[PDB]
Design a protein around this ligand. Structure first.
Ligand SMILES: CC(=O)N[C@H]1[C@H](O[C@H]2[C@@H](O)[C@@H](CO)O[C@@H](O[C@H]3[C@H](O)[C@@H](O)[C@@H](O)O[C@@H]3CO)[C@@H]2O)O[C@H](CO)[C@@H](O)[C@@H]1O[C@@H]1O[C@H](CO)[C@H](O)[C@H](O)[C@H]1O[C@@H]1O[C@@H](C)[C@@H](O)[C@@H](O)[C@@H]1O
Length: 160
């Protein structure tokens, strides 16, 4: 039985649970910060978009990012910085036919998926303040224990 769907909210995800977000839409999918050394946002770009400048609100502030996606898959850009005075930079990308995006707090690190479905894999950003990372989701989501991560990886890559 799936733990969800839950509607968009700001919360503090517990350690060792995947938050799996089911985006139908373009724009910001999630954003998270501990206000110290992690700011992350995942931004969705629909299929077959030629190069263009778009505006996104990250933590209440408007940013202009130039995007492109000539694929028939959706593209999710992971934007990141580790300091409040820095600018957001593109760190990684997930290219997806399923439109599911994941985040996980585990083992002193923050985990997301990247690469291209059906072979998306996990990678991490480091932090010395993991517990304090909160997230705001902009679409409905499910919660899946890390003990069942192979299921979450299956969903990411082949659909709910
Ligand atoms: C190898 C592994 O288990 N991969 C896991 C990944 O594990 C990390 C994680 O636990 C971090 C925590 O900070 O520690 C890493 O290990 C450290 C170790 O403590 C020290 O030796 C240190 O000095 O260095 C190493 C490495 O830096 C662990 O390796 O955790 C992530 C987040 O949950 C998992 O996504 C990842 O799991 C693998 O993911 C692959 C896709 O990228 C692929 O799907 C693999 O099948 C998958 O592994 C399988 O599932 C895991 C959840 C776990 O059950 C593993 O045993 C299993 O093979």
């Amino acid at each position: 039985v799936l733990d969800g769907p839950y509607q968009p909210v700001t919360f503090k995800p517990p350690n060792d649970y995947w938050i799996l977000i089911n985006s139908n839409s373009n724009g910001v999918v999630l954003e998270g910060t501990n206000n110290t050394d992690v700011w992350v946002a995942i931004i969705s770009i629909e299929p077959n978009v030629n190069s263009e400048s778009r505006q996104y609100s990250l933590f209440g502030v408007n940013k202009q990012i130039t995007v492109v996606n000539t694929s028939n898959k959706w593209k999710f850009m992971e934007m990141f910085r580790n300091n409040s005075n820095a600018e957001f930079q593109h760190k990684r990308t997930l290219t997806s036919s399923t439109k599911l995006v994941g985040i996980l707090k585990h083992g002193g690190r923050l985990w997301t998926y990247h690469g291209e479905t059906p072979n998306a894999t996990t990678d991490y950003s480091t932090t010395s303040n993991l517990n304090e990372i909160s997230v705001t989701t902009y679409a409905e989501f499910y919660i899946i224990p890390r003990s069942q991560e192979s299921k979450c990886t299956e969903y990411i890559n082949t659909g709910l």
